[PDB]
Structure 1
Amino acid sequence: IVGGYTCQENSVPYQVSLNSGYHFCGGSLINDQWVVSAAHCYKSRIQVRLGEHNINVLEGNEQFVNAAKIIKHPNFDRKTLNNDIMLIKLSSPVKLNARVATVALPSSCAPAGTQCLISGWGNTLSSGVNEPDLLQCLDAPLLPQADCEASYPGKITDNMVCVGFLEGGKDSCQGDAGGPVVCNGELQGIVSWGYGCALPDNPGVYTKVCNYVDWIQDTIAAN
């Protein structure tokens, strides 16, 4: 997250860190046994870390659970990034508490202008690299699809939504992928892609979760 702020410790209880030796992507806990992330975050072996604030310090609120099942959306395109969503079934149900909680799926698609909260441990710099120890937060609005299209000519599908600022300055960045975009208590987006970070005319592009509620629910029930 570039241009954000350090989240209040454990104030984003649904935020998880996907780890395979090091933190490499974010994710969101949707039920005590399932996490939703980005398909481009796929790895054959993934450890889910919940209740994290400082990913480099054992604070005492963490829960480490391995991914038993990793299911990418069947229509995920690794080039266009269309359908960039993935589900992870945990090897064991996590213990829910004030610091490890679930986030609700969308009741319907949120319109442009809706204010949301983006979070993650991704790079905090537009130029150069700085990997934060502490979870970063960013309040940003869902942008009109026309503006998203104008910023990314011919690259935006209805399964994508731009969130951020056309003037740049604040945005998600490498390492935030798979993380949450929560608006009014509902997971409306998943950190996916973009050109650079916090650059003018190139706000981040996110997977539009409201288009996948049926797939998510069907997949969980079948696995």
Structure 2
Amino acid sequence: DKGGYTCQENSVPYQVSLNSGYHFCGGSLINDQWVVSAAHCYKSRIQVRLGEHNINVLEGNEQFVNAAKIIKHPNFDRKTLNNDIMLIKLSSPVKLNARVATVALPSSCAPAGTQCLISGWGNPDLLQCLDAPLLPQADCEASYPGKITDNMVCVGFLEGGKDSCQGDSGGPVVCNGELQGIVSWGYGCALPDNPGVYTKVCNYVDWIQDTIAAN
């Protein structure tokens, strides 16, 4: 397994599941009509499921809403994964409550060493959680020679053992109440010297705000 623990039910209210017949990616609710996820999670038709804990059972607090507009970063590179970020506008606003809430965009870039919370159904039935720190760029660079750009950040452990895995992409990395990362890629999962790589959200706050205001 990926080393996480089952999150306390609805303790990560901003977490969403992207579904096109089955769960294939995660995402984060940033306001009542928009979700942020990874660009490699793009699909022409996407249904967003909010308020989920067990994605295989109808629990009663879920909200199912179709994506109305899917906007990938204009500079996304499918090969290098640079700028792996995408915005999804929902068909209608969701009802915000205790199980369905938004997460704040970063005020600034969090420094290495900051402890964060990574969540996803990745490894799917129950939402998994993982407490892990942002790693220094130098360490990230050493683990993935020539593959890390300034729009990426490594989060995890160089000894491996704990990590996000397939099914987690697009999901949140929240540190001190702010969305600092988006699950993107890695070589394997929980492998030593190959911690997960995440889209560094603080580099896109203006793009996000500008895009939402215009759409």
TM-score normalized by the length of structure 1 = 0.95
Question: 1:196 Cα deviation (Å)?
Answer: 0.2
> Which whole-Å CA distance do the structure 1 matches of 2:122 and 2:9 have between them?
17
Per the alignment, in what secondary structure is the counterpart of residue 169 of structure 1?
coil
> Which whole-Å CA distance do the structure 1 matches of 2:40 and 2:54 have between them?
24
Question: 1:10 Cα deviation (Å)?
Answer: 0.2
> Which whole-Å CA distance do the structure 1 matches of 2:176 and 2:80 have between them?
29
> Which whole-Å CA distance do the structure 1 matches of 2:90 and 2:141 have between them?
36
> Which whole-Å CA distance do the structure 2 matches of 1:217 and 1:146 have between them?
30
Question: 1:33 Cα deviation (Å)?
Answer: 0.1
Question: 1:134 Cα deviation (Å)?
Answer: 0.2
Gaps of 5+ in 2: none
Question: 1:202 Cα deviation (Å)?
Answer: 0.2
Give the alignment partner of residue 195 of structure 2, picking from 189, 203, 211.
203
Q: Deviations over 1:86-137 (max 9, x none)?
A: 00000000000000000000000000000000000111xxxxxxxx310000
Question: 1:58 Cα deviation (Å)?
Answer: 0.2
Q: Deviations over 1:20-70 (max 9, x none)?
A: 000000000000000000000000000000000000000000000000000
Question: 1:175 Cα deviation (Å)?
Answer: 0.6
Question: 1:162 Cα deviation (Å)?
Answer: 0.1
> Which whole-Å CA distance do the structure 1 matches of 2:71 and 2:172 have between them?
18
> Which whole-Å CA distance do the structure 2 matches of 1:167 and 1:97 have between them?
39
Question: 1:18 Cα deviation (Å)?
Answer: 0.1
Q: Deviations over 1:168-223 (max 9, x none)?
A: 00000001000000000000000000000000000000000000000000000000
> Which whole-Å CA distance do the structure 1 matches of 2:79 and 2:167 have between them?
19
> Which whole-Å CA distance do the structure 1 matches of 2:82 and 2:74 have between them?
11
Per the alignment, in what secondary structure is the counterpart of residue 188 of structure 1?
strand
Per the alignment, in what secondary structure is the counterpart of residue 202 of structure 1?
coil
Question: 1:164 Cα deviation (Å)?
Answer: 0.2
Per the alignment, in what secondary structure is the counterpart of residue 190 of structure 1?
strand
Gaps of 5+ in 1: 124-131
Aligned residues: 213
Per the alignment, in what secondary structure is the counterpart of residue 9 of structure 2?
coil
Aligned to 1:38: 38
Q: Deviations over 1:139-158 (max 9, x none)?
A: 00000000000000000000
Question: 1:5 Cα deviation (Å)?
Answer: 0.1
> Which whole-Å CA distance do the structure 1 matches of 2:33 and 2:125 have between them?
26
> Which whole-Å CA distance do the structure 1 matches of 2:156 and 2:98 have between them?
28
TM-score normalized by the length of structure 2 = 0.99
> Which whole-Å CA distance do the structure 1 matches of 2:186 and 2:83 have between them?
15
Aligned to 2:27: 27
Give the alignment partner of residue 152 of structure 1, picking from 125, 144, 147.
144
Question: 1:76 Cα deviation (Å)?
Answer: 0.1
